Design an enzyme around this catalytic site. Structure first.
Site, PDB file in Angstrom:
ATOM      1  CB  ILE A  17      61.923  55.038  65.431  1.00 26.74           C
ATOM      2  CG1 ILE A  17      61.480  56.098  64.442  1.00 26.74           C
ATOM      3  CG2 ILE A  17      63.264  55.405  66.059  1.00 26.74           C
ATOM      4  CD1 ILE A  17      60.091  56.371  64.559  1.00 26.74           C
ATOM      5  N   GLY A  18      61.448  53.521  62.408  1.00 24.66           N
ATOM      6  CA  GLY A  18      60.746  53.192  61.185  1.00 24.66           C
ATOM      7  C   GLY A  18      61.291  53.905  59.967  1.00 24.66           C
ATOM      8  CB  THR A  19      61.318  53.263  56.625  1.00 20.42           C
ATOM      9  OG1 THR A  19      62.314  52.441  57.273  1.00 20.42           O
ATOM     10  CG2 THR A  19      61.868  53.827  55.327  1.00 20.42           C
ATOM     11  N   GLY A  21      59.141  57.425  53.328  1.00 22.08           N
ATOM     12  CA  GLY A  21      59.779  57.765  52.058  1.00 22.08           C
ATOM     13  C   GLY A  21      61.271  57.455  52.069  1.00 22.08           C
ATOM     14  CB  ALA A  23      64.078  59.979  55.890  1.00 19.62           C
ATOM     15  CE  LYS A  24      65.981  51.456  57.210  1.00 22.06           C
ATOM     16  NZ  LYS A  24      66.990  50.394  56.911  1.00 22.06           N
ATOM     17  CG  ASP A 132      57.501  73.633  56.717  1.00 22.07           C
ATOM     18  OD1 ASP A 132      56.261  73.839  56.760  1.00 22.07           O
ATOM     19  OD2 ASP A 132      57.983  72.558  56.335  1.00 22.07           O
TER      20      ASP A 132
END
Ligand SMILES: O=C(Nc1ccc2c(c1)CCNCC2)c1ccc(Br)cc1
Ligand SMILES: O=C(Nc1ccc2c(c1)CCNCC2)c1ccc(Br)cc1
EC number: 2.7.11.1
Lengths: 326, 314
Positions: A17-19, A21, A23-24, A132
């Site tokens: 899906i992507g990257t 920082g 975390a991919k 959070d």
């Protein structure tokens, strides 16, 4: 490729899906069950200061199991990587839903809000505070149902010893002694306002001016808010955590109950004891092991391949698909 | 949100493509051009010097094989970096999905890596973090170098022996050699479970040569993977190396096709109609290269022109 040897015994990798920082995220299929998962791949040499937050999130997700919490299936670790196998959430963030349109109607807001209340009431029943709660931390699954994520700041207010300022409770900013749960009810007040208004109740160009406004607790009530919405907002957005509405009175509040006429059902549909016999029996046939050994092994809840296979089989059963391991 | 008011005058936000800590990357559309971009959203309160290092380098570097910086925006809480859209994913992801690449396909890709790095070096920079995760494919399957947070101790497996020892151009060549091996093999030449054991392997500089590697590939690998940086192939001899030139018979074209000085008249004229000025008022403004909305609009219009679309602002 070294770091991927163990993972590929269990999962068939689909698109990245992507990257962002350290975390991919990669979509994958659990081989034994056929179910789609999302795999969060964290590089240990990039993660740095966020390593304790990763461990805090993992500890909380091992202990939390609910229809409105993104499920952890499996934790794997190499020299360079931590892998978290997670519930498939293709629907995007509640943040994306908010920014894509003008303010949500009171009715659209209630559909979404009743799911947020369900998740958080369950978190609190287990002795946790999330700390959070914000719209980037709520994802939609493929059934358009909300899933709470990012437990990296969570705590146990009565156990062994936060995030976006605009969502943070007055007592949490000023660093007070508390029962902790109450701060999450304030953050849910902020979310309720932003959903119906399309802007924050407290916002500013500087952190010092925003802090002062949160401490003041004065906010505008736009003309399009109903009296019912105004009354619920006043009860959640109390600066004094002792005067703020309890989770118990939130669950059957008149606003929450409007159009539904039953209270929020927060109890989890997914147990830690109370194993599913069909799943246990099917695991026993695959592993060629007896039921009782299998139950003892599953009940260890190690978040290894066994935990993942059990949980995804249980998910495969909830779909209506046959309770079968390939 | 106040943190998003200015950004949303210029960009329509689409889905998240990644989140880790302070950093989130979101897809977006640049409203005036209709062009897609990637936006890196960094929370200032959730590492700041690394971010400033990357921004400084990208403001000064402009090249067909470097992921382009269009726009830098800052609020109380956020730094936004508007970047070239790369939907083809990481070279890393591409390699592992194929197990490994043919020598033919490795060359197509490697010539683009050599182009980018020879240009970086020509500008007095060393990248220092060359690895396949730091190379992205754009919509046309052309490579784009990213992550300039280190500049002129990235991943140990890609670090040169003399770099590990604390005693800049030669080290990037070693890293491209590692990259060359992984492209054709699908695994690292030096790998281990501990940092001390990996360091020892890199220092000794011995690696296995799989049976599928051609003699030409073996020879180029030995020239790049020399432990002594004085014995290692130069960038000059890499550009026209016999392996590099095999299917092509011309050296690597590393010079940038993407200028700071030369301005495109069609783009300047179209920006003048939107801005309500004459030429020269518009030229002087563009030539400041502030990485504000004007730099984004100019660079995207230029890209819109390179793809063959009309040179038009909405
Ligand atoms: O499932 C996730 N993301 C995702 C899954 C599928 C798709 C996307 C994201 C992109 C949007 N198009 C549909 C495909 C996901 C799940 C958990 C976490 Br934490 C972070 C991301
Ligand atoms: O555009 C980018 N990445 C991207 C966009 C879309 C997709 C990906 C990456 C992952 C591969 N599958 C398709 C979806 C991108 C560009 C620059 C930087 Br820095 C970081 C990310």
């Amino acid at each position: 490729m070294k770091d991927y040897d163990e993972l590929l015994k269990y999962y068939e990798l689909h698109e990245t899906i992507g990257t962002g920082g350290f975390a991919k995220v990669k979509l994958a299929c659990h081989i034994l069950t056929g179910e789609m998962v999302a795999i969060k791949i964290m590089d240990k040499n990039t993660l740095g200061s966020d390593l304790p937050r990763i461990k805090t999130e993992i500890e909380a997700l091992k202990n939390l199991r609910h229809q409105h919490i993104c499920q952890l299936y499996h934790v794997l670790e190499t020299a360079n990587k931590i892998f978290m196998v997670l519930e498939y959430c293709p629907g995007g963030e509640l943040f994306d839903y908010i920014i894509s349109q003008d303010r949500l109607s009171e009715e659209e807001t209630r559909v979404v809000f009743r799911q947020i209340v369900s998740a958080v009431a369950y978190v609190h029943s287990q002795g946790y505070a999330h700390r959070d709660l914000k719209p980037e931390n709520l994802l939609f699954d493929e059934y358009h149902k909300l899933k709470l994520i990012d437990f990296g700041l969570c705590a146990k207010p009565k156990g062994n010893k936060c995030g976006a300022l605009a969502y943070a409770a007055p007592e949490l900013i000023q660093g007070k002694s508390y029962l902790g749960s109450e701060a999450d009810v304030w953050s849910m007040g902020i979310l309720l306002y932003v959903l119906m208004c399309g802007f924050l109740p407290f916002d500013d160009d500087t952190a010092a001016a925003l802090v002062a406004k949160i401490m003041r607790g004065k906010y505008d009530v736009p003309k399009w808010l109903s009296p019912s919405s105004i009354l619920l907002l006043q009860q959640m957005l109390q600066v004094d955590p002792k005067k703020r509405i309890s989770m118990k009175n939130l669950l059957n509040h008149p606003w929450i109950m409007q159009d539904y006429n039953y209270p929020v059902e927060w109890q989890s549909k997914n147990p830690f004891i109370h194993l599913d016999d069909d799943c246990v029996t099917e695991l026993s046939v695959h592993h060629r092991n007896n039921r009782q050994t299998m139950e003892d092994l599953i009940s260890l809840w190690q978040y290894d391949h066994l935990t993942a296979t059990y949980l995804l089989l249980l998910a495969k059963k909830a779909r209506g698909k046959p309770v079968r391991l390939r």
